[PDB]
Design a protein around this ligand. Structure first.
Ligand SMILES: Nc1ncnc2c1ncn2[C@@H]1O[C@H](COP(=O)(O)OP(=O)(O)NP(=O)(O)O)[C@@H](O)[C@H]1O
Ligand SMILES: O=P(O)(O)O[C@H]1[C@H](OP(=O)(O)O)[C@@H](OP(=O)(O)O)[C@@H](O)[C@@H](O)[C@@H]1OP(=O)(O)O
Ligand SMILES: [Zn+2]
Length: 410
């Protein structure tokens, strides 16, 4: 029991954000909130639609959620944990908030937010609740703690019965790689990321290290590093441009004390440590199993979505009739519901992040520095994706592939 009022907004500072939630770390002195983060949902510019209630009917505690914050809490603990495991997942504790606290918080951090983020979304000041999670950038509560955030994205390729001849490049080239080309076009990134999510998930030592190095070279919105809660690499609530020579010098120096290596080598040693931690723990393996719940791709699943909402299928009837996916539409409701539900769970896994906390059971021995590091892994950002979003998923996919295709015509 706790109600945060307008005065409490002074005790929270900006940490980061995505497209759904704004996150703030504690900067006050209250013993009850020290070492915690606050996850506040944003409104873009009642709790579940009828069709969402039909889709999540097997989970009754889910469909009876009073607000959207409890819904997220019950989605993680009733759907995602039975799939990922409870060891590295925190569902978090609820806390009551006021309309004013939320408004003051919104205003407090505005200046530290990205310009375009301020444009698209602000905090939803109509919610009476917020999520309190453990601040993973702190090791627990030892000395210093270097923390690494990774947004791995999708690490498998569609193998589909349902991807057309004209989109067959989707079988060979990753979604992440293809998206980079579109992102660059809409000036959402400065340069094409060198990171290939197929390497990180490959379960191969040399390929994981290759992936970690690429995440250093072009962090964008996929790689962040924190010294004791303080951002020392990556973007602040957005994607960031290439690690320049200068960013490199600062990060190399920020590593002093923690990594015991001679100047100009602490970085290559640190990237060895992150690689060893990721590879050794195999925490990615079980997440790939959840991403693979998208078995038919959006070009397959889309047909099932129109069967679920009882709407005539546009894709089938507005295309060539002899190429209509009769296969999928012949499927019973229960089957149709299963595919789309598993697709939405996969989307959660495709969009989550991983935070590895390091400190001088789970441990790494760095031969080049002669040091030992304890580490903890936690999954974060395990949101429930709206069912309505299947339609925008198909449009986005159709936009990415066709733009990739016509670029290959050069
Ligand atoms: N428990 C935590 N400990 C430390 N940092 C956190 C924690 N939770 C969130 N963050 C930071 O806050 C940022 C945004 O949190 P996140 O849960 O990804 O918001 P989101 O808007 O739901 N993301 P997305 O839906 O992918 O756009 C992350 O990139 C983290 O750096
Ligand atoms: O659609 P994509 O795969 O690009 O993923 C986007 C994701 O939507 P999805 O996870 O529901 O698809 C968004 O999540 P919401 O906050 O809107 O819930 C947000 O995280 C974007 O930054 C992601 O773009 P990215 O920068 O990672 O490419
Ligand atoms: Zn169809």
């Amino acid at each position: 029991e706790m109600i945060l009022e307008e005065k409490d907004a002074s005790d929270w500072i900006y940490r980061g954000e995505g497209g759904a939630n704004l996150v703030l770390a504690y900067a006050g002195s209250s013993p009850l909130f020290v070492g915690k983060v606050i996850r506040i949902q944003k409104a873009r510019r009642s709790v579940l639609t009828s069709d969402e209630q039909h889709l999540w009917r097997e989970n009754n505690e889910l469909i009876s959620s009073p607000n959207k914050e409890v819904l997220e809490q019950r989605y993680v603990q009733n759907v995602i944990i039975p799939l990922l495991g409870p060891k590295h997942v925190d569902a978090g504790v609820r806390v009551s908030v006021s309309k004013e606290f939320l408004e003051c918080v919104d205003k407090k951090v505005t200046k530290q937010r990205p310009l375009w983020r301020v444009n698209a979304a602000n905090v939803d000041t109509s919610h009476d609740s917020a999520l309190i999670l453990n601040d993973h950038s702190l090791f627990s509560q030892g000395g210093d703690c270097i923390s690494v955030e990774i947004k791995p994205k999708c690490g498998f390729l569609p193998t589909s019965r349902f991807i057309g001849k004209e989109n067959m490049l989707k079988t060979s080239v990753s979604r992440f790689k293809m998206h980079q080309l579109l992102k660059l076009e809409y000036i959402e990134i400065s340069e094409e990321s060198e990171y290939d999510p197929l390497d990180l998930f490959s379960g191969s030592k040399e390929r994981v290290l290759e992936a970690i190095k690429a995440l250093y070279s072009t962090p964008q919105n996929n790689f962040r590093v924190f010294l004791n809660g303080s951002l020392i690499l990556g973007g602040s609530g957005e994607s960031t441009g290439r690690t320049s020579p200068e960013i490199g010098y600062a990060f190399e120096d920020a590593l002093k004390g923690f990594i015991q290596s001679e100047d100009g080598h602490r970085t290559e040693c640190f990237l060895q440590l992150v690689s060893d931690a990721v590879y050794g723990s195999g925490v990615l393996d079980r997440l790939l199993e959840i991403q693979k719940l998208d078995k038919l791709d959006i070009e397959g699943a889309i047909h099932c979505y129109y069967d679920i909402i009882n709407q005539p299928c546009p894709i089938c009837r507005e295309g060539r009739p002899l190429e209509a996916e009769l296969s999928l539409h012949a499927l019973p409701l229960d089957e149709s519901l299963k595919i789309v539900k598993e697709y939405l769970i996969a989307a959660t896994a495709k969009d989550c992040s991983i935070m590895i906390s390091f400190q001088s059971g789970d441990y790494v021995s760095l031969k080049p520095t002669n040091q030992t590091f304890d580490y903890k892994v936690h999954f974060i950002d395990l949101s429930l994706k709206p069912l309505k979003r299947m339609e925008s998923y198909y449009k986005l996919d159709k936009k990415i592939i066709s733009f990739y295709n016509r670029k290959q015509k050069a």
